């Protein structure tokens, strides 16, 4: 019946990347989570009037298993490439994540979105103009999200689904 989209979250560790999927899949209005629960990473949603199922792979915490990235990325139809807006290194990592996705998927046009994540109150070091310019150079959308207020979270995932639908 309904379409299932396999989405993969990628990006540097240690800077709050996991908050994006947790806040999406969460009981939006109760701050609670058991990731061990069968289908704590599947969510039925309605995007532009069309019901679909999101299956989200977020291997947050496994970043040091660098030789597994190809295997994990291969499972995805669309990718959220996430950096922290107060961690310049995580932003500089984005280019290599995108190159690796293109290689694994053997395509120069893989559905993906760039996500700038605000994970704390430490001072921002990546300005939105820098990230917009990077996203434009790649031809992909840019979404900024808060790891605490859920702002931008739906927009990030729904924008990616639209990129898949319009591929």
């Amino acid at each position: 019946g309904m379409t299932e989209y396999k989405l993969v979250v990628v990006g540097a560790g240690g800077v709050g990347k996991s908050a994006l999927t947790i806040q999406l899949i969460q009981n939006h209005f109760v701050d609670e989570y058991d990731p061990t629960i069968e289908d704590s990473y599947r969510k039925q949603v309605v995007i532009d009037g069309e019901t679909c199922l999101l299956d989200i792979l977020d291997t947050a915490g496994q970043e040091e298993y660098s030789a597994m990235r190809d295997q994990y990325m291969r499972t995805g139809e669309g990718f959220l490439c996430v950096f922290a807006i107060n961690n310049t290194k995580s932003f500089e990592d984005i280019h290599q994540y995108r190159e690796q996705i293109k290689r694994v998927k053997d395509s120069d046009d893989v559905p993906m979105v760039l996500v700038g994540n605000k994970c704390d109150l430490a001072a921002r070091t990546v300005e939105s103009r820098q990230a917009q310019d990077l996203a434009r150079s790649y031809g992909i959308p840019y979404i900024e999200t808060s790891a605490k207020t859920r702002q931008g979270v739906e927009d990030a995932f729904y924008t990616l689904v639209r990129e898949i639908r319009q591929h």
Binding site: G14, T36, G61, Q62, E64, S66, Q71
Partner: protein, 469 residues
């Protein structure tokens, strides 16, 4: 009737339970949240022991209480005032008779002695299983030694004297089996000839056995201190999670070595022999329940340089295709079949650690440190229980040793494996991908021929073990 308690003014752990200080989950109660005072009261409760709470608490408490403060609180818990004589006792004493002291004797037997013994059990578990607090804070250790060494009175004496000795042993700090381990197997490389050791010259059975011993030892060395607080992801990860990182880096190095062995074998026939040998090693990993090793192989075969080698895949024997496919299926659907298989096998095993890491991280990130109730902030203990359920599972698989003999030279060979050399990661993985493109070019470029590189027989000895008398 219930025993009367000290006044909560002189002994803080006698305050009544209320939703302002403790919340239970919906035959001992399970705590959802509470003040630190209430958590310590229930950690050392007079009515029952809760050894899984002791482990949970001692594994996770540093997220809400400093080690120095925990020790102060359990010493306060230990120092329980005795009740005054009752009216009947008073009347006996006024007549020159010995009082019965029934209420005093009951309070000693049913409140003081169980609480004090359970405080000592916290101390014993703390020293035996979480000694890193004392290694990192010498003054904390001094305070613990002084507390234990000044407990008076005969009811606790056996355990006080024991805990003193345990502490002294921990400051300056053998396996038996149902059967003999199997004989070490040799192929082209013979014992002592380490210079010839390689993927195809060692026996594939013994490659899998020695990697399993190595990977089991790495798995067994990871302590919960390297996991709680998600410290392996933070800036001080090399300080706080060294055994975990060593384990992961071994896994990464072996995966990269498998990829390098494959793509640097440019002759197609030889490369088929290399991949077939790796799948045989995977078969023995499966037989040994070394799931880390299984996924090391699967990760290599799904890497960008190897996955695209259609001409190699075509020549792999059908039975080996099926072995590799069923290993790959363990990881599908968020490791559904892996998780079921891990929970069904008979240990020893070597779990894949990455799932535990993701679940600990997401449990930490996805649940609040405190719950706000009736204007009070209560420690969210349910969150810590969930983390300790994961660390408890990890520990359960760390207990069982493999009945396999170490071969010191083969062990050293795999300990010293360094496929990347002095190259940086991007450099090296680009090299592997460029080799893949060289040996099997993208269509419609023609497939070239390449000379053989191995001078010894490529035929595998197989992976069924042999047994001479």
């Amino acid at each position: 009737g219930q025993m009367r308690l000290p006044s909560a003014d002189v002994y803080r752990f006698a305050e009544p339970d209320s939703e302002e200080n403790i919340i239970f989950e919906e035959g001992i109660p399970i705590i959802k949240a509470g003040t630190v005072i209430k958590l310590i009261e229930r950690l050392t409760y007079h009515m029952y022991a809760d050894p899984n709470f002791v482990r949970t608490f001692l594994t996770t408490y540093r997220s809400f209480c400093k080690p120095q403060e925990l020790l102060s609180l359990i010493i306060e818990r230990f120092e329980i005032p005795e009740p005054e004589p009752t009216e009947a006792d008073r009347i006996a004493i006024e007549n020159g008779d010995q009082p019965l002291s029934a209420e005093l004797k009951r309070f000693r037997k049913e409140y003081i002695q169980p609480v004090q013994l359970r405080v000592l059990n916290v101390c014993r578990h703390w020293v035996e299983h979480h000694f890193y607090d004392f290694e990192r804070d010498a003054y904390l250790l001094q305070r613990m030694e002084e507390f234990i060494g000044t407990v008076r009175g005969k009811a606790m004496k056996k355990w006080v004297e024991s805990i003193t000795k345990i502490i002294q042993r921990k400051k300056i700090a053998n396996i038996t089996f149902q059967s003999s381990p199997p004989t070490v197997e040799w192929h082209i490389s013979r014992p002592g000839h380490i210079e010839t050791f390689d993927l195809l010259t060692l026996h594939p059975i013994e490659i899998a056995r020695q990697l399993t011993l190595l990977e089991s030892d790495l798995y067994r060395a990871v302590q919960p201190s390297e996991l709680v607080g998600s410290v392996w992801t933070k800036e001080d990860k090399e300080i706080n999670s060294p055994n975990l990182l060593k384990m992961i880096r071994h896994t990464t190095n072996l995966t990269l070595w498998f990829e390098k062995c494959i793509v640097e074998t440019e002759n197609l026939e030889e490369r088929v022999a290399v991949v077939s040998r790796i799948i045989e090693i995977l078969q023995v990993f499966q037989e040994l329940n070394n799931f880390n090793g299984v996924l090391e192989v699967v990760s290599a075969m799904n890497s960008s340089p190897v996955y695209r080698l259609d001409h190699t895949f075509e020549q792999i024997p059908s039975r080996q295709k099926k072995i590799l496919e069923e290993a790959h299926e363990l990881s599908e659907d968020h490791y559904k079949k892996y998780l079921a298989k891990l929970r069904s096998i008979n240990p020893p095993c070597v779990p894949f650690f990455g799932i535990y890491l993701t679940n600990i991280l997401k449990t930490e990130e996805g649940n609040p440190e405190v719950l706000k109730r009736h204007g009070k902030e209560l420690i969210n203990f349910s969150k810590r229980r969930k983390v300790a359920e994961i660390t408890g599972e990890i520990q359960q698989y760390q207990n069982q040793p493999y009945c396999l003999r170490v071969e010191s030279d083969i062990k050293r060979f795999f300990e010293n494996l360094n496929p990347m050399g002095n190259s940086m990661e991007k450099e090296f993985t680009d090299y592997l991908f460029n080799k893949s493109l060289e040996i099997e070019p993208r269509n419609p470029k023609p497939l070239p021929r390449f000379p053989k590189k191995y001078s010894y027989p490529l035929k595998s000895p197989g992976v069924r073990p042999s047994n001479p008398r």
